[PDB]
A paper describes a structure:
The R2TP complex is found in organisms from yeast to humans, and consists of the AAA+ ATPases Rvb1 and Rvb2 (human: RUVBL1 and RUVBL2), a TPR-containing protein, Tah1 (human: Spagh or RPAP3), and Pih1 (also known as NOP17 and Pih1D1, but referred to as Pih1 henceforth; Kakihara and Houry, 2012; Te et al., 2007). Pih1 is the multipoint scaffold of the R2TP complex, coupling the Rvb1-Rvb2 hetero-dodecamer, the Hsp90 chaperone machinery (via Tah1 in yeast or Spagh/RPAP3 in metazoa), and the TTT (Tel2-Tti1-Tti2) complex implicated in activation and stabilization of PIKKs (Hurov et al., 2010; Kakihara and Houry, 2012). The biological roles ascribed to the R2TP complex are directly associated with its ability to interact with the Hsp90 chaperone system and function as an Hsp90 cochaperone (Boulon et al., 2010; Izumi et al., 2012; Takai et al., 2010). Here we present crystal structures of Hsp90-Tah1-Pih1, Hsp90-Spagh/RPAP3, and Pih1-Tel2 complexes that together define key structural links within the R2TP core in yeast and in animals and reveal how R2TP connects the Hsp90 chaperone system to the TTT complex involved in PIKK activation.
Interaction with Tel2 involves the N-terminal segment of Pih1 (Horejsí et al., 2010), which contains a conserved region of unknown structure (henceforth, PIH domain). We determined the crystal structure of the mouse PIH domain1–200 with single-wavelength anomalous dispersion phasing of Tel2-peptide cocrystals (see below) grown with SeMet protein (see Experimental Procedures) and used this to phase the mPih47–179 apo and SELDpSDDEF peptide-bound structures, which were refined to 2.1 and 3.3 Å, respectively. The PIH domain consists of a twisted five-stranded β sheet with one face traversed by a helix-turn-helix segment connecting strands 4 and 5, and the other face traversed by a coil segment extending from the end of β strand 5. An additional α helix connecting strands 2 and 3 projects from the end of the sheet and packs against the larger of the other two helices. The phosphopeptide binds to an intensely basic patch in the high-resolution apo-structure formed by the loop connecting β strands 3 and 4; the faces of β strands 1, 2, and 5; and the coil segment C-terminal to β strand 5. Our structural and mutational data characterize the PIH domain as a phosphopeptide-binding domain that appears exquisitely adapted to providing specific interactions with phosphoserines (and possibly phosphothreonines) embedded in highly acidic surrounding sequences, characteristic of CK2 phosphorylation sites.
Residue numbers in the entry:
A (entry chain A), B (entry chain A): 47 to 179
Write the structure that this text describes.
């Protein structure tokens, strides 16, 4: 089993309560092809990101927020080199988080509310070494 | 006739030579609806930006680059308030430039090479007051 490395943590919410998405990474996860930005838009218009941007869409795990309240986390893990590209591009980072949100909704039957933010001081919600992919 | 206001200038290239895209603006151009980022991804996957992100796809105009060499400019003008949002979001700015590039290719039969950059010291290539939309 592959243990993910923390990347960054996205806080959002839903009619079912608070949700955190750990955008995390591993060198064991296949990277997307390195396409141009023009080609990336094409991928979206052809609705092919489901196959062309590999990511793990992790199972929900119950956790606690900083106020000690119950919430739900999901680990979305991508290739480490791809993660490092995402970090250095607001465009790519926001796009990939948006794709990951859609992926979790479709996979788990969730309905997220649209507002989200990347946490500044906390990288991952949950026990990392317990969250094998 | 509506005169566009300069926004920023994108330098790119093509098998036909150097191309500049003036991402410019006017309060007379209808704004896109103010959708969420989740909804924006949906718009792209449904390939509906052609109707849902209004922009003028300006006619080509011959100009000169800083080296005195011939090149071609196109003015892509959006609503001023929308422009100001784009400015303060790398994600939105890169997405809209990518959409504008596609729009010009489809409208004018162009094939742009993928590399482009936003000029840092020059806002618009061409005679602004002559470029009525
Ligand atoms: Co298209
Ligand atoms: Co979809």
């Amino acid at each position: 089993q592959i243990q993910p490395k923390p990347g960054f943590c996205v806080k959002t919410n839903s009619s079912e309560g608070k949700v955190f998405i750990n955008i995390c990474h591993s060198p064991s996860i296949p990277p997307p092809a390195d396409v141009t930005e023009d080609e990336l838009l094409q991928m979206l218009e052809e609705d092919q990101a489901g196959f062309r941007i590999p990511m793990s869409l992790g199972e929900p795990h119950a956790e606690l927020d900083a106020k000690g309240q119950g919430c739900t986390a999901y680990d979305v893990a991508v290739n480490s080199n791809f993660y490092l590209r995402m970090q250095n591009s607001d465009f790519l980072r926001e796009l990939v988080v948006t794709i990951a949100r859609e992926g979790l909704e479709d996979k788990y039957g969730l309905q997220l509310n649209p507002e989200w933010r990347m946490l500044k001081y906390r990288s991952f919600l949950g026990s990392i070494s317990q969250q094998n992919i």
